[PDB]
Amino acid sequence: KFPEGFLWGAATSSYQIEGAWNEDGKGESIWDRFTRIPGKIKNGDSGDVACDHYHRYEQDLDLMRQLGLKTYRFSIAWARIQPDSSRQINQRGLDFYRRLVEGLHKRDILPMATLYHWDLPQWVEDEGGWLSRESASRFAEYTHALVAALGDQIPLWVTHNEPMVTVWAGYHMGLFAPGLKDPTLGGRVAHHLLLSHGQALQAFRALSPAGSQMGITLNFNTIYPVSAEPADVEAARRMHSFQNELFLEPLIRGQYNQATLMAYPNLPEFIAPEDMQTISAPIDFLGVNYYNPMRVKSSPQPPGIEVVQVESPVTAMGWEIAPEGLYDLLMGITRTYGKLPIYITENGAAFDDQPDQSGQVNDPQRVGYFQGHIGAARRALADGVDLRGYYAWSLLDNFEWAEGYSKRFGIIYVDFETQQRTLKQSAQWYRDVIANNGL
Numbered sequence: 343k344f345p346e347g348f349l350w351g352a353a354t355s356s357y358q359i360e361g362a363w364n365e366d367g368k369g370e371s372i373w374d375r376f377t378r379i380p381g382k383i384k385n386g387d388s389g390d391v392a393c394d395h396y397h398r399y400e401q402d403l404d405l406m407r408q409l410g411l412k413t414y415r416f417s418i419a420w421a422r423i424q425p426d427s428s429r430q431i432n433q434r435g436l437d438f439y440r441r442l443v444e445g446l447h448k449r450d451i452l453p454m455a456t457l458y459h460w461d462l463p464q465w466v467e468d469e470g471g472w473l474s475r476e477s478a479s480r481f482a483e484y485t486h487a488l489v490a491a492l493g494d495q496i497p498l499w500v501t502h503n504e505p506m507v508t509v510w511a512g513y514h515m516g517l518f519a520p521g522l523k524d525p526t527l528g529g530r531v532a533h534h535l536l537l538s539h540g541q542a543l544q545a546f547r548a549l550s551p552a553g554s555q556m557g558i559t560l561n562f563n564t565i566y567p568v569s570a571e572p573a574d575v576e577a578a579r580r581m582h583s584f585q586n587e588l589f590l591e592p593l594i595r596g597q598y599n600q601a602t603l604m605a606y607p608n609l610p611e612f613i614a615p616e617d618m619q620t621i622s623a624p625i626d627f628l629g630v631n632y633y634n635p636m637r638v639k640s641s642p643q644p645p646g647i648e649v650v651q652v653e654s655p656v657t658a659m660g661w662e663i664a665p666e667g668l669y670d671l672l673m674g675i676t677r678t679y680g681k682l683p684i685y686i687t688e689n690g691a692a693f694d695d696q697p698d699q700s701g702q703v704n705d706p707q708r709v710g711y712f713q714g715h716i717g718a719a720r721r722a723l724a725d726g727v728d729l730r731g732y733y734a735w736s737l738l739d740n741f742e743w744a745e746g747y748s749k750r751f752g753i754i755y756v757d758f759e760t761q762q763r764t765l766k767q768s769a770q771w772y773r774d775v776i777a778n779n780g781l
């Protein structure tokens with residue numbers, strides 16, 4: 343059994359579920375724009391409608407209640423709040439989150455809100471987006487507004503979701519909005535993401551909302567060398583420092599690591615005198631997102647590291663299923679950076695789900711994923727990790743970014759033609775886990 347009061351949840355993000363993309367005075371986000379670009383998204387899909395959750399949120403709140411969720415992690419669409427460069431608050435957008443949060447509490451579900459889950463308002467992008475240091479101040483102003491409005495109604499706040507993905511997918515690879523493909527920008531962007539977190543945290547501390555805490559969510563891929571050879575070991579260590587500690591090192595220690603400074607030699611040009619102190623001010627908790635490990639070998643070619651693909655066992659995303667990677671990640675963070683409070687803010691899997699003739703959605707592979715991963719999380723808790731909660735990604739099948747609707751991560755099936763929701767077997771199973779407070 344997990345600890346009494348352990349927070350079992352499920353997670354979503356705003357662009358992935360809400361729809362209502364141009365309703366109620368919501369401004370365009372960089373993802374509204376990105377999804378109009380032909381060729382960027384599988385099937386030419388977008389989040390224009392998604393799960394239609396902006397309209398259907400009460401149905402989704404009842405589904406959360408049906409499962410017995412203790413907590414629900416969502417993100418806030420910044421462009422619903424500040425549609426445009428006037429910076430004026432859009433009250434209808436704010437009201438939606440107020441109604442959502444009130445509905446959570448009415449059902450005894452603790453809200454966890456992510457301020458930034460990738461859907462930057464286009465107006466912030468027009469002012470430089472994360473290339474501009476001033477975006478950190480815009481993000482702090484957005485945070486201040488939301489925490490002034492809802493701070494003591496939302497007990498757990500996360501600033502950023504997965505800043506490494508914003509850097510890599512958004513600026514290195516152009517896979518995600520805003521679609522830049524210039525690896526030399528990644529340090530600058532990383533710094534400004536971190537600075538925005540620090541300034542948002544400052545805003546949060548100044549407001550000091552009763553009973554509320556703020557952290558940040560980072561993704562990680564536990565790294566294993568492909569062999570015991572020294573060069574593979576060295577490549578794996580360098581890849582871990584970059585892949586897994588690019589953000590944690592400055593957040594906890596107030597410095598960038600060497601792998602990061604090597605990757606982005608101009609990074610120190612963006613660091614003003616008090617930025618590292620601001621970035622490293624204490625967080626209340628760390629959000630951990632984990633799906634899969636990465637297997638590394640050395641290479642002779644720059645940068646001397648190769649990630650090796652794994653054919654099996656994998657999910658529909660081709661991501662290796664290795665629950666021991668979750669245990670090892672948690673133990674490593676805890677050993678390296680100390681026993682701070684951790685929430686697993688995402689863990690889950692995509693499989694090709696299909697209703698049967700009777701309308702049931704039986705997803706045993708997803709059950710098996712959760713069984714392994716929740717079990718690994720329990721072992722990490724038994725071995726001294728301060729794990730406070732676990733959020734299944736996702737409550738709902740949703741818009742999976744550049745994969746569009748080709749990937750289903752929900753524990754609840756969504757027919758996107760009719761918006762019908764059906765609990766999958768995994769949701770039924772998870773309800774039982776919550777009720778038992780463990781496996």
Ligand SMILES: OC[C@H]1O[C@@H](O)[C@H](O)[C@@H](O)[C@@H]1O
Nearest residue numbers: 355503504561688735742751
């Ligand atoms: O890809 C599955 C999930 O990966 C996570 O990196 C993101 O935070 C989610 O938005 C995404 O749906």
